[PDB]
Amino acid sequence: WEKASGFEQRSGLNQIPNRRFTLWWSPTINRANVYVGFQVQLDLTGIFMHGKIPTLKISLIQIFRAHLWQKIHESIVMDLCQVFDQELDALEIETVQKETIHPRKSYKMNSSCADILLFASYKWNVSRPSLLADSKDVMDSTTTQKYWIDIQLRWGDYDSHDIERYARAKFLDYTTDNMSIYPSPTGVLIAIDLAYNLHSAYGNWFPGSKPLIQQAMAKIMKANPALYVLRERIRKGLQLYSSEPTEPYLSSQNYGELFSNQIIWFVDDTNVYRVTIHKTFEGNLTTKPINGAIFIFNPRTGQLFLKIIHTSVWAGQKRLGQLAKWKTAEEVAALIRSLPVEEQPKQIIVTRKGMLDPLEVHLLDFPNIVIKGSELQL
């Protein structure tokens, strides 16, 4: 925040420092739940003001000037259309059309149209509605040919910025609305929080479309042009400068995602079945088993859950190399049950590929935890 270069008219107060202060603390000045009676929406944006703070309004209109809110919306619709056009054969999409968006759509918070239509080659088994981050989807629910995609933008604040929950609520409001114009019963709504850079989706998924949207939204939030102009305008509004000369060496997308809203746990269990070989009088080498451990690591808090496996479990069994793997999954399920609900993970990353199968079998009470294997196992 200091003077950005190296050492060597009318009176009144100047509003440049006060507007900087009011932007920076604006998730807390613009609390949405303090008093919840009336709200004012700014003209071409979807920003709600709770209470009349007039330096804050100038700060925010400086950011969303020259129709930036619409520009962001159209840039994201263009990017998703270019994602689906690369993928016509794999998902069996006949065509992908962009809807002629009523110009005022992206900041109209009562009702919504569709933004993209996918027309099928044949037919798509459609599952029941769920979030973008859930895993186990059964495609039995319905069958269709049309499939719509709706993009939503919001600007969160301190009291309200759960974006999964926003996506769910907007989906169930708009699709059950009487006044809705959706082209088919089936589709997804995608919600993006510009204040916090969060995103989610909710809706019907057809086969292969959920992983596609996950990758596409991660890439879009990282590298959109219009989002770059938004984040750039915020930093100029705050006069914030970076001390550091380059981006961190480990700037990979996978690495960055570990520090999002979601809880992610690394499980390492190669050391569960651990032995020592010593020499015998018989001449054949013998192995005695010793104590093993499962490591569970939470990167965001730096918490290591260490489960010490005493060799007493291996006493009477025959094939030990699998029993350890099976045990490794049962203990992880135990820890997830033991923790509070807000502590529990959304994703688990396993270092060993073969660990991926039993764990997913054993986590039945918790179907929404996804399990995968990363490229940065440690």
Binding site: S243, E244, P245, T246, Y249
Partner: peptide, 29 residues
Amino acid sequence: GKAQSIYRPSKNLDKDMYGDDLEARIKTN
């Protein structure tokens, strides 16, 4: 003030600290 600079692999300082590779120095000792 306390990386501020880009990382390059530095010149092998084992010749400076120990006079040779540390592992070799243990081998001789």
